[PDB]
Design a protein around this nucleic acid. Structure first.
Length: 73
DNA sequence: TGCGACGGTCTGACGCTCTACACAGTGCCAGGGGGAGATAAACGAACGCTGAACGCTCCGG
């Protein structure tokens, strides 16, 4: 079973791989002595991957609150 | 040519509502052509003013 931690970890890994591709493309077209850690990395893929996981996914489900038993189940 | 078999191709895979949701990482400005809106004038029209003018009942000396 992929629990909640492993699923969110996989989504963060996909976002970070996209970020690594973006930063590779950035450093292939950038000069040295003008690179700052605040600049060459972009957090947009990570947040986009997380938000695309928590919504419109078959795993992150709208919790049913009919009764406590349904919540636990 | 006959042979299997190898492979691609192609199809659907009972029914409805109660429910039912939305969608994400990389340039920049100058010169030039059109039409939207404000402007002040214009040719023509009819819109008013001029009371005048025709005709009526009229109270009348």
């Amino acid at each position: 079973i992929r629990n909640v931690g492993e699923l969110i970890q996989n989504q963060v890994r996909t976002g970070l791989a996209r970020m690594e591709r973006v930063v590779r493309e950035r450093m292939t077209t950038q000069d040295v002595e003008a690179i700052t850690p605040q600049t060459l990395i972009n957090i947009r893929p990570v947040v986009a991957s997380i938000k695309e996981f928590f919504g419109t996914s078959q795993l992150s489900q709208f919790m049913d609150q009919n009764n406590p038993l349904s919540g636990l189940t």
